Design a protein around this nucleic acid. Structure first.
Ligand code: NA
Ligand code: NA
Ligand code: NA
Ligand code: NA
Lengths: 132, 130, 133
DNA sequence: CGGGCATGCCG
DNA sequence: CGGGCATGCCG
């Protein structure tokens, strides 16, 4: 069953690697709760990872334990392992997204949380609420 | 829990793509109920697909409602989708395996079967029978 | 059923990537017909590829129409494609294996042959006669 | 498509 | 075990 009192996150991207952005929304109402403006170079998995950790921090700051939904098997695993295993080259052109990933990993390594991170079941429920 | 009153299918593959064979067994006895003679070139997933559909036909012909276990989540989806989304090249040397896939796909598009198709949970239960 | 009047090839490696060697033997008698001394760094699949192409050339110069057996379906396909699809980095340490693979591809791309390259069916026939152990 | 993943013979 | 080779959801 869908947990309606939850937050849903999703990446939007052009190419992969390419321009990436993400947002987090109320799973029921669609209210946009946070967003990340387009990053010129990134990968889908890096964006999905940042989006979950942003939701974790958003909810922690508000003393909320409600679940987060993502449709990214890879990003959910990366968050559980506290390590984003991206193959994207790290240089001056990718320094932005790599710094954001560094900071997300740092947050996960320095905080605990009860937030359930749940797989959105696209085949059953249709597109995730935060889809672009 | 393991539904013991079932069939289990397994595929044997010498490389991938490569020589492929399969069989269906009684989950509780290991009796071999049907088998496919080696196929010169196929993929593991095509073997698993064909093995499921063979078991579906075998069970329907016996008016059996036993489930089928497969270790292959991909082939289970293919059968539920009625379409084997294989990347194997269609040419003269793979004609046989693709012929067999097309016949199985035929059979799925004209029958609505009773058989539950279950994933064998090797990580908990050990190797699928044979 | 086995074509006993044939060549069988096999590869021995220590590590992967690692030290690679290979040999070709008379399937019927077990006699070593050719053997490649240790190559310091290569992959198993590159070694299996080189061994088949060595067999092709060995049979061609001996005016032989005998087939080759290999237990590597990967290397059989690579030979069929005339391309060894190895991921091994090209650098100074891998220069020798890559030179050999590049020369083997050149030979395949400039020569025709009728030699059947056949899959040795280990689980059904036992260990290939050229096995290292 | 690419990104990463799940899953499929040899040292 | 891990690594070289493969067959196979989401933007
Ligand atoms: Na997504
Ligand atoms: Na998502
Ligand atoms: Na396969
Ligand atoms: Na190899």
């Amino acid at each position: 069953e869908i947990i309606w009192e939850s937050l849903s996150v999703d990446v939007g991207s052009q190419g992969n690697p390419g321009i990436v952005e993400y947002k987090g929304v109320d799973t029921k109402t669609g209210e946009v709760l946070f967003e990340r403006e387009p990053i010129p170079i990134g990968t889908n998995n890096m964006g999905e990872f940042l989006a979950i950790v942003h939701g974790l921090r958003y909810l922690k700051e508000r003393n909320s334990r409600k679940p987060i939904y993502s449709n990214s098997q890879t990003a959910i695993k990366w968050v559980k392992d506290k390590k984003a295993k991206s193959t994207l080259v790290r240089n001056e052109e990718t320094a932005l997204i790599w710094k954001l990933v560094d900071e997300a990993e740092e947050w996960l390594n320095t905080h605990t949380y009860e937030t359930p991170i749940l797989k959105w079941q696209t085949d059953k429920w249709g597109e995730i609420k935060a889809d672009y």
